[model samples]
Target chain A: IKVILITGMPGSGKSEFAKLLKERGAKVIVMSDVVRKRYSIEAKPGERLMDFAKRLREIYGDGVVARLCVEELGTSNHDLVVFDGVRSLAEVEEFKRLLGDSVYIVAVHSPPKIRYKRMIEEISELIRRDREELKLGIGEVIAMADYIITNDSNYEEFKRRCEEVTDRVL
Target chain B: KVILITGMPGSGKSEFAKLLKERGAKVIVMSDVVRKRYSIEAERLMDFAKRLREIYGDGVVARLCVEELGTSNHDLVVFDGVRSLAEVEEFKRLLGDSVYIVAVHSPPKIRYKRMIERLSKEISELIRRDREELKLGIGEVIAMADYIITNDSNYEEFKRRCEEVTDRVL
Candidate 1:
């Protein structure tokens, strides 16, 4: 399978890009869903998602989520897989190791002002989330992406660019 | 027009900015703004920049650059060493749509070697510096670049690519 991993900060349009890829007939796997599934069962009450994710990393090594994703992918039959919401180089490395040369990473970016406006969270909470994402090494994953899509413009422009990049990537 | 240059510590942003300068674009290096304000040695520069951010917020350096740019009539201006999306937003807010970003990229191994040679620092120090820059959101700036110049190869190749990109932007 051709694996295209989507990464970005919160409100950076990663889900939108993955949605585009899904419309293009790619099998979409949101990494957070993987964590959320485990979190729903194993997480302590009132624990933040960020804290749960970090705790999982501490317990199972940095690649644990990616490994879980990989296991989830084992039975998939699609030729193209879109993995959304990758947050660390360790997870990326894990994907590369298992998926080999077919793995491609795409990052979406928007400035904090644009992103914050898109998010429903308060400014303080958004800033805290940004710090948490950066601490998880999402910035490194973004920097190393094979392709970057800027989503600072209108939705139509972003969607058109997303189609263009998806066409190029596929 | 304002062309902001951004990258990791040793990603050849300086070399690209030098090329733009040779093309008659007036350049303002952000680090120079910090150095002029504090007159500090190179070793303390990162810590100083971080402290400034802590005190004045992430757009502090960009604000200083705008102050330094007061009354300049240059048509084509380059702002070097932009480290975050906050800085980019500051430039855009101050300068409007004339602001553009060009990111220079080299792999971490390549940058690590270049940083070691240029800064005479150990691997541990360089790694710390890399993490610090990531923390400051340099990677997001790079990911959101209007143009990206990869510098993984020899200088001649990088220069050729920079020239091509500069021609298109200029």
Candidate 2:
């Protein structure tokens, strides 16, 4: 029940990293999927995403989602479960506490230049309109990450980085 | 014809739609297309969604959904969650007099349980989300529903009630 935490800024190739891990026999438990399934709501305009975050934060405080995700991880015997887009430092600390040394963080990022460019072209279905300063500043997770994978290259190179991260994770 | 599925998130709207789809209704997700147009992901997209609506006008998403319905794989479309009255009015105006908004309702306890029980967050988080959903156009949509599907029972019973409504409409 090892949880591989994948943290990234928007459009930093987190989805690509998730896909890569998924290919290498990792069961990915995305935060978004859990939220959507729990909420039964599709992504839409005028969603009030901050309000959404605030709701979750207010309900469980900052670290509850992280702890809950790790608790679910215990239900499985799988060696790797991929998790992405952790929003706060409290999440990181709680995850560490829950997994107690079994958790590994796989940080995928590109230069801000590369990421904003992708935001313009719109690579991932999730990020729209190059994230504003507020959205991009979920820095607590970034700072707490254990292994950083720089995704500034071609898709294959990105895939290779995923392999590198996976090797370290496994 | 447009079959609008409106409910507060976590009210089993998607679950209802899934049953409809299984029973051979053409389920066209209006929200999914909007998210695609903007590259809005499941997590932290609400911030940009207000901007997307502002840039495109509130009706822009509904229009896109209607337009997509023209080329949609389904013969009839299911809109999962329609936010504003304006959005609903536009759907009614464009799709002719036959357009119907089926409002789904659930007890707050049911909704809270749905949100909290999915391992997404702790019990406290569920309470917070319950409050937020109440504010996110939940009342207006429920009031405006052409039909009401109250999901108080198990999924099997839920499907049975929804089918009774669909039978009348179809």
Per-residue alpha-carbon lDDT of candidate 2 for residues A1-170, written as tens digits (9 for 90 to 100): 67777776667788888886777666887876566543445334566654555567667777766766766567455565677767655676687676556777665656455676777763543334223312322433442245556676699887876786677667
TM of each candidate vs. truth:
0.67, 0.46
DockQ of 2: 0.01
Worst 10 residues of 2 chain A by lDDT: A128-137
Clashes of each: 0, 7
CAPRI grade, predicted model 2: incorrect
Over 4 Å off, model 1: A75-78, B1-4, B9-26, B30-78, B83-137, B140-170
| Candidate 2 Cα errors over 4 Å, as ranges | A1-170, B40-43, B71-75, B120-134
Q: State the lDDT of candidate 2 residue by residue for B90-115, as single tens digits.
A: 88777877677776766455766677
* Model 1: per-residue Cα lDDT over A79-124, one tens digit each: 6788899988899989888887778777787766678888875789
Which consecutive 10 residues in model 1 chain A have the weakest lDDT in total?
A73-82
lDDT tens digits, residue span B1-170, model 1? 88999988878889998998888888999989999877842347667877888889989999999999898688798999998889999999988887888888776677887766763378888877777778778876775567767687798998998988787776
